[PDB]
Amino acid sequence: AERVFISPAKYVQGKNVITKIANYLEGIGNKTVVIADEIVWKIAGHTIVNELKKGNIAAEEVVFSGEASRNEVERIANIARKAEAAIVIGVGGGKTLDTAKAVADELDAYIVIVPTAASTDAPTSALSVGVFESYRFYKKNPDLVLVDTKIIANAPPRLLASGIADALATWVEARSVIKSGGKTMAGGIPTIAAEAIAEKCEQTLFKYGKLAYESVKAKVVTPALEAVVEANTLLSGLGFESGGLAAAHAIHNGFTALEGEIHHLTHGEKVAFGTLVQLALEEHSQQEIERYIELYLCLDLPVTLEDIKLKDASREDILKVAKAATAEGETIHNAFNVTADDVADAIFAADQYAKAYKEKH
Amino acid sequence: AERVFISPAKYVQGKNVITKIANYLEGIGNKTVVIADEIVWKIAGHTIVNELKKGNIAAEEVVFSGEASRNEVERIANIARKAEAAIVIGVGGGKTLDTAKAVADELDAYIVIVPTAASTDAPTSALSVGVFESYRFYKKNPDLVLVDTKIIANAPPRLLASGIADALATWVEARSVIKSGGKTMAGGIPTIAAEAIAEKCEQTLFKYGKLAYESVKAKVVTPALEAVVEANTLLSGLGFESGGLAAAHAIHNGFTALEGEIHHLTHGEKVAFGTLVQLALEEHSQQEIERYIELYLCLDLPVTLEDIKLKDASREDILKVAKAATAEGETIHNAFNVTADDVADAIFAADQYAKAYKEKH
Amino acid sequence: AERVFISPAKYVQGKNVITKIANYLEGIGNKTVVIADEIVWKIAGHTIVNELKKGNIAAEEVVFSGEASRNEVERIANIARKAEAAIVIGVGGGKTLDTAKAVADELDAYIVIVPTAASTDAPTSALSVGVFESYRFYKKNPDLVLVDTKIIANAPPRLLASGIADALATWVEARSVIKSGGKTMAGGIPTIAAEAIAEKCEQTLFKYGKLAYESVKAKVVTPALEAVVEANTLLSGLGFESGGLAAAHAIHNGFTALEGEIHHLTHGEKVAFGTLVQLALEEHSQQEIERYIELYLCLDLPVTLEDIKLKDASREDILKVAKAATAEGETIHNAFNVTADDVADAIFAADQYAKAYKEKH
Amino acid sequence: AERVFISPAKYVQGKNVITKIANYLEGIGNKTVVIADEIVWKIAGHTIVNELKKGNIAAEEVVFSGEASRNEVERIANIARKAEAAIVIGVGGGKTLDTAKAVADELDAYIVIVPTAASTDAPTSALSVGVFESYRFYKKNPDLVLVDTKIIANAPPRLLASGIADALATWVEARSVIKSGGKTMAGGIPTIAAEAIAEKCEQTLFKYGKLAYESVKAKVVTPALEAVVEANTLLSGLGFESGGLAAAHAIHNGFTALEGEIHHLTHGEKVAFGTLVQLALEEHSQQEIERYIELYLCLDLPVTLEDIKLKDASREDILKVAKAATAEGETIHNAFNVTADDVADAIFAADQYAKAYKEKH
Amino acid sequence: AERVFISPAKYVQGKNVITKIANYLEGIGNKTVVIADEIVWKIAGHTIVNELKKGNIAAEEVVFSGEASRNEVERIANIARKAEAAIVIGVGGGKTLDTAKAVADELDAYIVIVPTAASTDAPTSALSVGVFESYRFYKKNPDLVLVDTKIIANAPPRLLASGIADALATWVEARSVIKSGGKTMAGGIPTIAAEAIAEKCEQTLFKYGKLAYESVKAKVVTPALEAVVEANTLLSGLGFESGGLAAAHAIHNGFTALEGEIHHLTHGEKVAFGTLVQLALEEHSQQEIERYIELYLCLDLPVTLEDIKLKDASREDILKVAKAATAEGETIHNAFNVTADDVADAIFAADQYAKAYKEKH
Ligand SMILES: [Zn+2]
Ligand SMILES: [Zn+2]
Ligand SMILES: [Zn+2]
Ligand SMILES: [Zn+2]
Ligand SMILES: [Zn+2]
Ligand SMILES: [Zn+2]
Ligand SMILES: [Zn+2]
Ligand SMILES: [Zn+2]
Ligand SMILES: [Zn+2]
Ligand SMILES: [Zn+2]
């Protein structure tokens, strides 16, 4: 079997790096399109445009509607066409970054991804996704991912905790794919590079995660925050894409089978619970499971069905989640041979294990 | 300080993957130019062309002159222009792959790199180099690095040993840059991703290196050979480019200050000795140094001045090597504060340490 | 001395395996007799009969009176004779399974044992037992032990805790027989196979026991519950029969010398206390003893005389228990050289040690 | 998935236990048939008959032709029919024991298996097998396996070394099935009981194997020999049947695709090499592989192609072995996803690894 | 069971302590009898008498005949009677010290034991023994054991090696009695004091034994020699008497069943082989056994049948040794349940294990 590793061309992370944007685009082009929603234009959008102007780089300001639909992409791509911009700059959260990637594919443009929170590991990836249907690949991983830690230190602590949750799934999922001989999102078995990256991701989070969370609460940049932002973005990104997905993200996707307040949680908050479910489907001792539960609690992340807005959910409701999670083509099959009923049982088990832990402290 | 990580867009490694070349180029183009020297055209060049024809992909066969000069690049680029090929495929050793990268930059073409030996970590890099003058960056890291382990299992054992030598410098050099707060070739401080990759590189080589060497001697592909080819290519490549260079490659470059039979050694063989010199400049116990010497000997690699064709070299000759190695702009300054005289002393020390080891077994 | 190992011919465990009963009996016979009490006929008895009918297997439904007496066996054996059934299927708890084994011996019939709780390690054994008089062997160990974890996940949590208690005695007792050169129930010294099984039994219970207990409380099947059901049934069964019994089960038997509410406790609940008594008769540190007490408490099992309904029992009452436990022929002599008075003292010591632990938390 | 564990009903091992044969058959029957070949009748056959006569047990003496064919079984079964014997006693090596099992299935007779060497783990199993075609199950595992260590201490040392070789494959193969989620010969996933048994098997052999080999050379029974005979018979038997087979026995079977002197080696000698091939297909360091090679050499077992009478074998010959080993239905697929070409490469690698070790000592 | 510990009243060890003899006897008496053979009178006998005269202590010089018979004791006791001596001083080797103890019992005299070699652990004991018949206890352990290390440093190295051999049996034998619940020579189970003493004995010998052996070869007193003399005398003495005897000394006694050159070996030399036999009867790995063999060889002690003058001994001869060793009342039954045949096998096994070790170095 062939091993495959893919990656964005360049990843740059540091305090105030947003100010050198004109610098990194020098020998690339002098015309760009900048995509952000209303809030983000105030947070970083104008700062970016102003930095590009200083360097004589034109910039068409686009206000993202807030929905990553084909129409919005078509609308934005037209604007870029007319402005004849060769560089797409997406700034902000998930939906904006995905839209920007779709836009860049239409135009065959150089794409710069500028996250304003380290909340998911979508930034460096070549893939995207009310009910989940499938994963789709873009033509490439992003050309430049620019991560400004000063910006992230000012984003809500809840968003850093969410990114830690999403990154904590990386080693759990990749390890299960490596052990089962399964395939990664990249198409082949995992490389040793991805295994090393994924395992280091977990180590970095257990070591610095709480200190990074406190740093954000005080809105300061520290070595601990720099370490966790890299884990949440570069390690988690490469780890999941080239290391492999399994049950945790399948459960996250399964939640789309339900309607309700659960959908106000972040991707990371849902993945935290999904990760506990994967651990309940594996052979771990009580102490190994509690090591994760303890960390989630110290980051104010959800660990019970009640925490994810599914208090007293019925077996039938959980079964819908399980059926969606075990749909043909889901990632859970890359590491497990389970039925929807096994998965439904594991969801209730994880809830019971977390409650048992809580009723001990 | 900003951390920077760069990487080729896609790395694919496996037995007989050369046969799926038309498959990986499908949604990219139908016209290519293939670059290889006379020997390599027989080894893999024709197989590639034949695989491209089956998929209706045109291919201009170019015979590399054997010298990576501006003229040769200009000559090859013209041919590609006329054929109006959008994909450059370079097959073979170092000089051919570098030339192919230069060609792809002229044409702004998609580039595929196909090494026929896992002898250096140049394949995945965005950089190139009778006396060494400086490093120069290409506009990008390669789009696709395709590594066929069946081909490498048939290449000379000496070439695998050379690649292991070059890869064994990765952790030594990167660790010294990380400890000193120095910068990598990529421009910033090392990421945690590169540190993880570099350290895993060394572990993989001590674990599987000899088994991989025996596999090649028997011309068979095994899990051990697959592990070492990845270490020699993807881990060593990312590790040195994004992890950092230091004294070992500076010494390799310093040898160009001399004329002689030493220049028939491979890049890896020279780096092996360069690595011992770096260890002699650091604070290690005798046992730590011997751990490397032992491995080099079991791979038939050079460990003494006599082994690198500099038997009884004079202090003045070694001083020339040291002066070149400590030239302004060399990588040794990223991790050390040493003079040419300190380096000359370390070269003789490494030789003495290796002899002392040999005169013990 | 000869080593002897005995075992049921086949052990099958899994979720919903009760549904493949007709499948496992295919090449055996087409006529059976099913034995269960009133409650169990509703729990699993009818499901089994219905599964046998689908496969054209006749089944005489027998309602167990609830008492494992010679008359009941004779009564059931007659029915089987008349129906001329060649397979006996016993479903339910201890008394029913023993009766079914006795029935199968009368008829020389193939016997299937289907426990509805994993509460004791009697299922796989070839032996049986108001005052205890002696152990008696059946002509064989059961032909097929079929353990459906979905059924056990729905049985009371108290019954799983009881089975864990009975299984926690396995390594304690077998280790003492191995160390003393004593004989097992199977007739010779223990094999290495039994030692391995017994020791793994304890490890499995400390690792997964609490998670399995929580799984049952939520009525779900998990890897942890699957592990503990095997420990409680196959490992504990082989471990005690072919590994050896010692003081713990001797104390359990000694309780029959008393009348009272203590006899409403389960076999496992009594063995838990019996196990603490054996530990008090051995040389263990306070920490080693507390490791077991801690686990018993987390499973809501009894650890004091008060817990086993013998609050403020008199020395004379405890002495009766001790005399019965040290009767000629009891298993305590396979590992200890103690008098009834030593055993009476150990019963009070275990109570005092547990109280001391409790008066610390 | 369901876990399944099967086992012979009773295993008895000890010095001179052959003398209590009449004792173990008391409450079973008074008429038997004894099967052995010419040599074995002298070694133990007459001793057994004489022991049965003392207890008034009739015994039809059957001389096994030496070939385990349907005709021989039919011939022997007739004799048993006429003598109307209810017990079949097979004494000797592999072919005799298999024949005896086949005979017992025809007659639905109680079967006693009495090995005269501890050379394979076939004794306790319910299965059998010039080119290998498939495995076939008997209706049951043997009723009684009686292993007399005094007899085995007098059998050739080469036969004990062979049994150690066959038993050393147990943990390697079972561990690979457990890790891959594959199925055992018994039909389901492995139980924890089988994992414990298999792993203890390897430990016992590394600990006592050489001492047991020296014991046999001096023709004496020691604790070390008693431990290894149990490992070679009961642990290896249960471990492979209920723990799982993988690549090692598939390679052993693949050798039947060849004609030649290789077929004078014992089953164990072939499995030793097959085990090295499995280790070459896995990810192990040089030191882990050499730990096994070292032991094989100290037991005078084969480790190279030359040792197994295939010196300078051609790629085409090895490919035939590989194709047979990877046939549809072989056990290698329970733990690996490899092609015949991958397996051919691993055979040459194992040879090269062993030679490399030898050319070091 | 009661635990019992016995000991000589006072043990004094040091360089030149023989010179303070008059000092230790001050408040005891002014008349003594000194017993020694011809050689010892020259070695230390006259020095002692001269030291007693200086202190005005009378001393009847007795020349021991060399045979510890009733007549010799009666002869010596008469002399003491007439001299009306109240103190018996025995100086020299085993037979002399035993005789002196017997003499002191007849007279109810204070007894001083002065060994001139540290070759056995008989000095501090209250017991004694051509075929061995039984152990007999004196009325008391000696009142004063006075060990002069200057004297022992001048005794033959072979005698120190012999004492180390006898002391190396202490922990092996005592540990087996402790594990089996057996009784010591002192009459009850072993105390914790004896277990501590016995285990420290082995540690002291592995740590300092070779250095003490080299010290004696150079005839010098060092801390290492002081440590080993105490181990050989006080630790080994208390350890065997109050810790327990088992198979090793039983084998030593069994040799008396044979006539021949074996009886020129020392007690210690015979115990060394006896110790290897006990290890062969226990469950130890090859490495654990070799740890002792290695030490014996470095002290020039016997490890094979050939070394103990029984080269090519017949099974019948070894069987005589085994029968005597397993006689009713021997110490082997305090820790083992073995037959004479098991012991004969273990004697040949130990020889084979030692040869196997030797044929490795
Ligand atoms: Zn995610
Ligand atoms: Zn809402
Ligand atoms: Zn290099
Ligand atoms: Zn030249
Ligand atoms: Zn029980
Ligand atoms: Zn009541
Ligand atoms: Zn086999
Ligand atoms: Zn032949
Ligand atoms: Zn002694
Ligand atoms: Zn003599």
From Swiss-Prot, chains A, B, C, D, E:
Lineage: Bacteria, Bacillati, Bacillota, Bacilli, Bacillales
Cofactor binding mode and count: Binds 1 zinc ion per subunit.
Binding site for glycerol: D121, D166, H249
GO BP term (any one): anaerobic glycerol catabolic process
Cofactor(s) in the UniProt record: Zn(2+)
Catalytic reaction(s) noted: glycerol + NAD(+) = dihydroxyacetone + NADH + H(+); hydroxyacetone + NADH + H(+) = (S)-propane-1,2-diol + NAD(+)
InterPro entries: ADH_Fe/GldA (IPR001670), ADH_Fe_CS (IPR018211), Glycerol_DH (IPR016205)
Pfam families for this protein: Fe-ADH
Residues that hold Zn(2+) according to the record: D166, H249, H267
GO CC field: cytosol
Family assignment from sequence similarity: Belongs to the iron-containing alcohol dehydrogenase family.
Pathway assigned in UniProt: Polyol metabolism; glycerol fermentation; glycerone phosphate from glycerol (oxidative route): step 1/2
Notes concerning its domains: Consists of two domains that are separated by a deep cleft, in which the Zn(2+) ion is bound.
PANTHER family tied to this protein: GLYCEROL DEHYDROGENASE, GLYCEROL DEHYDROGENASE 1
pH profile of the protein: Optimum pH is 6.0-8.5.
Recorded name of the encoding gene: gldA
MF-aspect GO terms: glycerol dehydrogenase (NAD+) activity; metal ion binding
Protein keywords: Glycerol metabolism, Metal-binding, NAD, Oxidoreductase, Zinc
Known function: Catalyzes the NAD-dependent oxidation of glycerol to dihydroxyacetone (glycerone). Allows microorganisms to utilize glycerol as a source of carbon under anaerobic conditions. Is also able to use various diols as substrates, such as propan-1,2-diol, butan-2,3-diol, ethan-1,2-diol, and 3-mercapto-1,2-dihydroxypropane.
The enzyme's E.C. designation: 1.1.1.6
Organism from which the protein derives: Geobacillus stearothermophilus (Bacillus stearothermophilus)
Subunit structure: Homooctamer.
Entry protein name: Glycerol dehydrogenase
Binding-site list for NAD(+): D37, G94, K95, T116, S119, S125, L127
